[PDB]
């Protein structure tokens, strides 16, 4: 997403970090997304709607 | 009920044993007894044939009581493929968006 960073990156160069694999990066990002959606750690972000 | 698969593989549900044999009444090389859910999966694969079984029904049969993580489905299939030594995936074939099908040469009743 480009947080604290000059440019946004797609799956390719995000894989280029440690292992250059696409579907693992996608599944990691999706796991992080449903983990953040958990009502226990999202009330501070829901207030910005 | 006696089931024949490719490569002279015989499965007996009454005694629940799988083995290699040219003659159904005379086991030659015994593989052995599959686990419980393995038996459930085999019976499902043999009970919708000729048509394949949709994923929802096999999911609801292998673990009915509790909804289980999805990977287990595929993983269970792996073991049911591995115990029947189906390395070439010729005994359990997977039809995309249609389900899982088993190959039966003949049934003895």
């Amino acid at each position: 997403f480009g947080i604290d960073m000059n440019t946004d990156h797609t799956l390719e160069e995000v894989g280029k970090q440690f292992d250059v694999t696409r579907e693992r990066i996608r599944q990691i990002e999706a796991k992080a997304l449903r983990k953040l959606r958990h009502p226990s750690r999202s009330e501070v972000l829901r207030s910005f709607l | 009920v006696i089931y024949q698969f490719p490569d002279n593989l015989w499965w007996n549900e009454a005694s629940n044993q799988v083995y290699y044999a040219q003659d159904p009444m005379k086991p030659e090389r015994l593989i052995g007894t599959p686990s419980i859910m393995q038996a459930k999966l085999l019976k499902i694969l043999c009970e919708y044939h000729p048509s394949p079984c949709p994923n929802d029904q096999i999911i609801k049969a292998l673990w009915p009581h509790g909804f289980i993580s999805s990977e287990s489905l595929t993983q269970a299939i792996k073991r049911t493929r591995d115990f029947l030594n189906d390395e070439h995936k010729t005994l359990i074939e997977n039809v995309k968006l249609q389900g899982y099908r088993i190959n039966i040469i003949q049934v003895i009743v």
Partner: protein
């Protein structure tokens, strides 16, 4: 905290799986049960139970209290 659902505890898929298989949905239902009642749940082993205990004790809670007129 007594009015949050079980998933808030952030249970391992094994745990949440088991407790969803026994229709244990609310933390009151978690606490009114005891350790032996949970250890009798199929696929609920000792180490699963100990990690439930650790996580639930993180939130100032424990097993075995009696909650009147729940719910």
């Amino acid at each position: 905290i007594l009015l949050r659902p079980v998933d808030d505890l952030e249970l391992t898929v094994r745990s949440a799986n088991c407790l969803k298989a026994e229709a244990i949905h609310y933390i009151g239902d978690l606490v009114q049960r005891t350790e032996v009642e949970l250890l009798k749940t199929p696929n609920l082993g000792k180490k699963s139970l100990t990690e439930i205990k650790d996580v639930l004790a993180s939130r100032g809670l424990s097993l075995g209290m009696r909650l009147e007129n729940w719910p």
